[model samples]
Target: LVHVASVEKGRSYEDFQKVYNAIALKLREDDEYDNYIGYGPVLVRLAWHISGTWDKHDNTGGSYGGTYRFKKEFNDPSNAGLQNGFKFLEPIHKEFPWISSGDLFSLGGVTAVQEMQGPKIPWRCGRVDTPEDTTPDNGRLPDADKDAGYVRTFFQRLNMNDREVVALMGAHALGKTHLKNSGYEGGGANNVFTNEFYLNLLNEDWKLEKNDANNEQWDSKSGYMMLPTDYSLIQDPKYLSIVKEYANDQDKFFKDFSKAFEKLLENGITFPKDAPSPFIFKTLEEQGL
Candidate 1:
């Protein structure tokens, strides 16, 4: 599973920038998805789901293969709502058919985060597609019902530490869990990409309750819900400290999240030392969105 990134011949920064512009333009044009929250959150989730499959031990899954484009992975019950993100990328992929699935998926995330005003995530290309058989089984992603201990252990397979885990979870600020998809509901800002997740977790008066779906979730009048895994950040001393740190300092959270997310996407892929440094993509706003 030691994936070595091979640059697409003759492709450079400007080429990828075109792909980014395509995604960003489509994002602005397609505002009807998810109640106008658009494709950003789900795109972020899609990127993470594809990359989240990495197993540090064998390097089995990770985003390198882009196997999610295949049926087995695409239909994984855990990935129920992600089809939107995939379909959103279809035309862009058709236009830039040369890009690999893994790269396209991960780039969609970088585009979404930046367009939504989140931190800049340094990106690198070169994930080659593997066969369908290389796709990991359905249950590799973390379960929302799990506790802090489980959350901490689940991410270890991705070689993520507590800091990385906490920082990444801050992405919860962008999207809400669908009851049909994961038995949880709204959590934070469904549109604006900020560190509101940490703020809500720290300040909200959350009560443990079962939703109509008959699953446990932390609820608040602020129209937010926290999965047990989200609540675990405060229940565990180690995770709580990081949560507080992020809540207090948005800049630090952004910096840490940018690094951790890049790591998450590149988990099993090995880039040669001579490979060019990661790309810091320009936001649509910078381009006069």
Candidate 2:
């Protein structure tokens, strides 16, 4: 039950950089998606949903196996709304057909984060696609209508600690949830990555109310919103401390998120001693593209 890193034959930094650049450019050109929130947020979520299926115990599902292309995994009710992300990547995949599905999905996240003025997430290649039967059953993703304890316990299976969990949740700052997609709705229609999720939690004047979908969520007069699970960060003592830390320090949030996200995408794979170091891609702006 071991997955070893295997670099796509003769592939190196430049190869992935082309893929990164393609995604970045598409992100810029397709600015009209999601009410102008763009594809970045959903791409990040797609990457997470694909990787979060991993069980550290048996390692049956993970970023190491890009089985999400299979019908069962793609149609997982938990993966609702991510079809947009997959569709977004379809053109890029066609151009770079050699790149594995797992790598492309995870790299879409890294590219999205960086191009959106988020931190530079060092990414590694070599996620060979596994068979359809290898895809883990659905329901492995966390639910939004829960509390801090539920959030913490759920991440335990994915091997994320309090810091990692809190940092990762910062991604919520990017995109609004659609009630039509995931039974939740709110406004975060932003593409930039920041500690604003934490800031909003501590600073917002929230009132719990049911949306059109009849699900309870925290809403603010400023049109911001939070799922119960997201709000739980400030509700729990331990998680609150870390939430405050990230809220006050933008650099720290970016740095911690980079680490946690890379870890999340790399959870179930083993890298060889002589494997190439992770690639830290340059954003399109950085290259003046």
Candidate 3:
């Protein structure tokens, strides 16, 4: 029963679709980051971190406000590596100039997930920009160094249940944990986005090691790394099953991922059950058709 403060009456689907195309095109253009892993993964992470701030009980912060663009939120230590995603989106924002930051950040995530062969996340268009003070508190995002129990409790504040938490972390499939970014070293190759995160978790006999560069936590499997929290998925019995489920079935992974990611983006906004279905924008390649 969350109520979005107010739709920017000045915006509409056609107007936002134009913004979508702008983002889609730029995403294709900007292909170098994190040792050539590209901007797609961080864009997905950006959206996750932005929307992950919601507190369902108080409705304090969520993607509805797009406050992440402000210095206060952008300066968050949890958001360390996300400036690249923001910088990538800047040109599109400058070009479209009229779209709200909420819409742009959320759509950047939606586009990244879909383009990376993840899921078709349905997106809404009502988020409006807010003032600097509206930026969320920093600790709202999860900590990488924590455990499954802590991860579980933290997500509950955002109103996400265990199944939702598992599905959302599957997003680790898209991006690596840069030691400089989160004090956790690596997880699979950054560019090969897939359910391989689950594969690595199931297969690797991870040994604890300090990365040569940042001296932060890591797995010594040579091919992968997992934060204490990421590893917690397999350590927890219930979470293990879903991790296995996604590893076994690509179809189910897509289905659950689509629902969970859509839910992630829609965290604080309430659609009238009578409200029309969400919008699905064409990919940059598909739009040529």
Candidate 4:
């Protein structure tokens, strides 16, 4: 099925900017969440989880449908701990009841990344909420206990190439994995967007060890950790080149991340010829709020 983009009636860039500002303001106010890592990281993860359901061949799930509002998608085991992100966006959704779930979820990621001093993400509006029955089933997300081949195969379903997969994984730098949520933990969460994930992967003295979950993960002397999937970037020669490139060049990482993330969110939807250009939101710092 082809899901064509449709802008919310009479809404424009300024309207979405208000939503962005609301999310950004709330992020600042809710500084106590996640041990002061705040809502930024979870919000980004929420956006990714919502969009990552897309299967390029069928075009069944993606940010286009906004089906995450449904129970099955919301309660997916793969989506554990994202309720915090949903709860954080509750007031914003209440305040702007017109915005679709997919748009808001995806935009939350964009706003959080920018507010956290990441690169500007160009985000489009107009992902309509499809019927509940259209919700993608659980287990569409990638697993953490995997290697290079699994990572590559998993992303192939999303139509993401090696660079895109590595760039998107850069988001791991923003939030630490919760042990209860994903059975892995500690990459030294920064609550800011950076190329540090790549740097840590390449530079850290990581040893393979079993965690409290009885799962093997790469633990570093710097008190950081990498899920086997995260550590795969370096194990694969192709992904290693991209990881090293991102680790060495901050500018390149930011640029590539913005592109890959936008593509990730836009997959499985067909934007019309007249759809508005993706909006690049101003950070709270830029707006001097």
List per-prediction Cα lDDT, in the order shown: 0.91, 0.94, 0.79, 0.92
Give the clash count for model 4: 0
Candidate 2 lDDT, 1-289, residue by residue in tens: 9999889999999999999999999999999998999999999999999999999999878998899999999999999999999999999999999999999999999999998899999999999988888988988999999999999999999999999999999999888899889899876678888889999999999999999999999999999999999999989999999999998999999999999999999999999999999999998888999
- lDDT-sorted candidate list, best first: 2, 4, 1, 3
Residue 68 accuracy (lDDT) in model 4: 80
| Candidate 4, run of 10 with poorest lDDT | 183-192
Identify the runs in model 1 with alpha carbons over 4 angstroms from their true place.
Answer: 187-189
Candidate 2, overall lDDT? 0.94
- For candidate 2, list the clashing residue pairs, or say none: none
Q: Itemize residue pairs with steric clashes in candidate 1.
A: none
Our model 2 lands, by Cα RMSD against the true structure, at 0.7
Q: How would you encode candidate 4's per-residue C-alpha lDDT over 117-163 as one tens digit per residue?
A: 99999999889999999999999999988899999999999999999
Per-model TM against the reference: 0.98, 0.99, 0.91, 0.98
Count: clashes, candidate 3: 0
lDDT of 1 by residue, 1-289 (tens): 4689987777889899899999999999999887778899999999999999888899899999999999989999999999999999999999999999999999999999989999999999989999989999988999999899999999998999999999999999887788788777764447777888999999999999999789999998877888899999999999999999999998999899999999999998889998878898888789886
Worst 10 residues of 2 by lDDT: 186-195
